[PDB]
Amino acid sequence: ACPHIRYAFQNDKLLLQQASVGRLTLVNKTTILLRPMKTTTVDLGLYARPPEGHGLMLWGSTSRPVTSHVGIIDPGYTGELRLILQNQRRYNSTLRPSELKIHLAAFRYATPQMEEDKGPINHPQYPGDVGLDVSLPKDLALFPHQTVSVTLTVPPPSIPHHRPTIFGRSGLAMQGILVKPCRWRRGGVDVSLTNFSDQTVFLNKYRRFCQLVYLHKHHLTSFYSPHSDAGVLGPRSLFRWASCTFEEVPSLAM
Ligand SMILES: O=c1ccn([C@H]2C[C@H](O)[C@@H](COP(=O)(O)NP(=O)(O)OP(=O)(O)O)O2)c(=O)[nH]1
Ligand SMILES: [Mg+2]
């Protein structure tokens, strides 16, 4: 099934750790400073085109007090990929070399056919959209250092062999607001938001605050192994990415 993920990579602050087991991992070569309750952004000098019928997912994993956004990359994006990190601590902290792994992998997804929004669920913009955006059904405030859940009870459209999952949007993650990715199961979901910044953040009713992605079910496993990662989704299912090889395509860098 998974043909080739075509990718370019140039960054002398980062190292390619391996393009095996269907997932590309980079690792930091130098210390990265993380200012407290501020957004730290790592430009990767990484570019990538997912093979047909697949999307790319981008994420950091670390053993330090730092949370990273999980990014769903539009299958048509051709720009430099960024990792967006958020700082737990209230003082300067650092990620030493290799304390930060950065992962890029693909997954099969489907797009429901919808002419209209179904409640908070915004219909797709064209047949292949990776994620449908989902709107806040009520004005929200988040005090600094607060988590808030929003409940969605609308039943998502249904697609055989696919598993509706919620991820955050990078715009909000740029603002210090992160969504905990998780399964949107049959009777509704509670989406977790955390204000990592130092200011109250007001979010307006109807604002798009996360996105719905239909992962194929082969990407959900109950097994920890080298082909899975428990850091992406909520306890219960781990994300297992497609098996793809990477094919280096220098000319994609821009
Ligand atoms: O961690 C990430 C996430 C996204 N991206 C890029 C690729 C993706 O296609 C694009 C959009 O990401 P999101 O959709 O999560 N952000 P938002 O929905 O707020 O903005 P856009 O208007 O670009 O969809 O930005 C990154 O480089 N890193
Ligand atoms: Mg988006």
Side-chain angles (χ1 to χ4, degrees), residues 58-79:
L58 183 72
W59 77 106
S61 78
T62 172
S63 253
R64 303 274 321 142
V66 173
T67 305
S68 94
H69 173 69
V70 177
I72 300 308
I73 320 305
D74 217 87
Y77 176 70
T78 34

Side-chain angles (χ1 to χ4, degrees), residues 145-156:
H145 320 294
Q146 185 183 28
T147 283
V148 161
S149 311
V150 357
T151 301
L152 313 169
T153 53
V154 159

Side-chain angles (χ1 to χ4, degrees), residues 5 21 44 56 66 68 77 106 114 137 140-141 147 177 191 208 218 227 243:
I5 302 174
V21 314
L44 301 165
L56 299 174
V66 173
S68 94
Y77 176 70
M114 298 166 75
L140 257 208
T147 283
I177 299 297
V191 183
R208 300 195 298 282
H218 294 326
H227 328 287
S243 295

Side-chain angles (χ1 to χ4, degrees), residues 6 9 29 38 50 61-62 65 79 86 88-89 98 118 132 175-176 178 183 190 205 220 247:
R6 283 138 40 246
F9 172 60
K29 190 160 99 197
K38 222 61 72 32
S61 78
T62 172
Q86 289 300 348
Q88 289 168 29
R89 296 177 35 67
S98 279
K118 182 170 183 183
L132 289 42
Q175 284 164 228
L178 301 184
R183 282 284 286 123
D190 281 283
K205 188 169 183 195
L220 298 187
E247 189 200 307

Side-chain angles (χ1 to χ4, degrees), residues 72 74 131 133 169-170 211:
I72 300 308
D74 217 87
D133 293 324
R169 282 156 56 77
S170 72
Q211 61 190 301

